[PDB]
Structure formats: structure tokens, C-alpha cells
């Protein structure tokens, strides 16, 4: 097998919750700074509280949901890894900001991972990053990353940090 970063693949589609649709889901940057062509790396609060920066990943704004879809048909994907959280670059100006209800990993229409099971009340700016390390079913065709904003999209700078597939075949 080999490991391939999601950000080194093209998606089928990638939607977000930002009002400005000319902005786009970001490879290897958080959403807002990336769309501003800034060098700011993706960064997250880890399990111990420390801040880690990541070279690779995806940056979105949660939506209803915002969905990033990959065609993995024939690729022999056996594993998905990512950290999930709200990028440090977000601004938690009040309790309405940086509040994400859940993030799911969906394969061929089945939720195979959801933050709702550990985090029924969702993610906030100070929730520690969630380490997702997940088997992917044989012969899978579609994998989707879905982030749900809830009431508002404000400050919902969701990053899939270090997001990578392990795969036996090609894409
Ligand atoms: C000028 C306008 O600014 C941004 O929209 C804001 C919105 O911004 C926050 O939430 C978005 C996600 O919706 C991003 O995380 C931003 O980085 C945040 O600052 C809020 O502050 C609301 C409050 O009413 O106002 C909007 O104008 C940006 O998203 C838009 O694309 C646009 O650039
Ligand atoms: Ca929200």
C-alpha cells in the first residue's frame, strides 16, 4: 500500500458554508486565510492542549452540510486518517461562533464515522482535535467528508488536518 494525502487528489465536488461562493475549499490552508492567499498553515489544538501545525490537509466552512466528495472507485482504499477540529485561525468572538454540530465520514451513503457519538453537543473552538483512524470497506466507490454548521456558519473553520488515504491501487 501507499499513503496519499487527500489534498494531493482532486475531489468530485466540494461545497462549503461561506456566503461568498467564489471562495473555494482549501488544500493545505485553512479556509479563510487560504482564500486570502496567506501562508498560514492549518493548525489545531491537540489532545493535550498544545497547538500543532500541519503541512497537509483540507480547509472548509461547515454548512448544511458542507460536503467534500472523492471518487475512490478501483483505488483499493483500506484506511482514512485525519485530525478534525476548528482551525486556530478561527475567531471565537462569542458562543455563536466556531460551533460545529458534527462531522461525518460517509462511504457509499453509509456513515462509517461521526463525531456525534463522542461529542453529542458538537465541536467548539476549544474542543481538542479528534484523531480519526478508520478502516474503509472493500470495493468502496465514494467517500464524503461532511461538516454540519448548525444554527450559523460563523467561524466554522473546519480543517481535516493531515487527511490521508492508504490505498493498494490508483485513483
Ligand atoms: C465580508 C464577509 O466576511 C465573512 O462573512 C462574515 C461572517 O464571517 C465569519 O464566518 C465565516 C463563515 O461563515 C468565516 O468563518 C469568517 O472567517 C468569519 O469571520 C460573520 O462575521 C458574519 C456575522 O454576521 O458576517 C459575515 O459578513 C466572510 O465569510 C465572507 O465571505 C465575506 O468575506
Ligand atoms: Ca456553527
UniProtKB/TrEMBL annotation:
Coiled coil: none
Residue ranges constituting the Glycosyl hydrolase family 98 putative carbohydrate-binding module domain according to the UniProt record: 1-167
Binding site for Ca(2+): 99, 149, 152, 156
Protein name per its UniProtKB record: Glycosyl hydrolase family 98 putative carbohydrate-binding module domain-containing protein
Residues of the full protein shown: 34 to 204 of 795
